[PDB]
Design goal:
This protein is an alpha/beta fold and 284 residues long. It is built from eleven helices and eight strands. The chain has an eight-stranded mixed sheet with strand order 1-2-4-3-5-6-7-8, sandwiched between helices. The longest helix is centred in the middle third of the chain and has 18 residues. The two termini are 30 Å apart. It is classed as toxin.
């Protein structure tokens, strides 16, 4: 019953933990290295400094459940961008934000815990929670009716975005639609795509050990099946698994649009250019 306004004051600087040798191994694999996770490139930053000075975008800090969640609100009704694995949201949104803003749509772009300048350390259930903070910030600090929002879930953001989509309709704050942008259909299948053939069962063990984590399917169950899900997949190994996912989802009655794309996994700008218009056509 605590749906209450959630912005906060930056007072630095961002903290993390150091844990056990093996979960250090794992977290690097699944989520990326802390340095990678937090890094914000010089060009990326300058473009962002400029944005604030023009009053195009403002820095935003939120009260997360484990700490603070940092990034920007960029403006031109609104995209909730959920970044994925391996780098700061700053980097991941940079090729993406322009394409929405140009059509006078605002984009919320906030790091999950352990990413960019946000506090804490990543985990399946932590990231889903941080998604809800970010949601609530839109609804509550900015009054935004949920049927002006879409959830752009890139990559690992894919399955996370799916869980948010569920929670929002399940809490009668349903969203205008979900974009699974080049999703991770499951962590196992993501770990699988970046390894080879039938490799050393060590790979198979870790892949198996982590079944049921960040499954789009699993995280979608109990979503109203008439909810708009655009699904754009990449042309590389991950994106195949997406096409199987696509099948399973049409099959189970989910209202699923989209197609396979001729773009690699990281080609965000090239992809957004082509599809930006279709995307806003499942926003209405």
């Amino acid at each position: 019953k605590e749906n209450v306004a959630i912005e906060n004051d930056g007072t630095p600087p961002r903290d993390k933990e150091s844990l056990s040798p093996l979960t250090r191994f794992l977290n690097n694999e699944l989520y990326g290295e802390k340095d990678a996770r937090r890094k914000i490139g010089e060009i990326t930053q300058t473009l962002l400094d400029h944005a604030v000075e023009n009053g195009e975008s403002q820095k935003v800090t939120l009260k997360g459940e484990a700490g603070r969640l940092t990034g920007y609100y960029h403006q031109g009704k609104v995209v909730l961008f959920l970044h994925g694995s391996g780098s700061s949201a700053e980097e991941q949104a940079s090729e993406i934000r322009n394409h929405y803003q140009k059509q006078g749509i605002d984009m919320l772009a906030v790091n999950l815990r352990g990413y960019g300048e946000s506090d804490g350390g990543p985990s399946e259930k932590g990231l889903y929670q941080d998604a809800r903070t970010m949601f609530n910030y839109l609804v509550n600090d900015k009054g935004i009716d949920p049927s002006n929002i879409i959830i752009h879930g890139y990559s690992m953001g894919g399955p996370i975005a799916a869980d948010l989509a569920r929670y929002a309709a399940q809490n009668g704050q349903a969203v205008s639609g979900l974009l699974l942008d080049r999703p991770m259909p499951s962590m196992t299948k993501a770990i699988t795509a970046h390894e080879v053939a039938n490799p050393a069962g060590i790979v198979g063990a870790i892949a198996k050990a982590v079944n049921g984590q960040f499954s789009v399917e699993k995280n979608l169950k109990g979503l109203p099946k008439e909810t708009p899900i655009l699904l754009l997949t990449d042309n590389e190994g991950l994106g195949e698994e997406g096409e199987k996912l696509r099948a399973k989802l049409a099959i189970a009655g989910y209202n699923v649009t989209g197609e396979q794309t001729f773009y690699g996994h990281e080609a965000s700008n090239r992809l957004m250019g082509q599809y930006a218009d279709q995307i806003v056509s499942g926003l209405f």
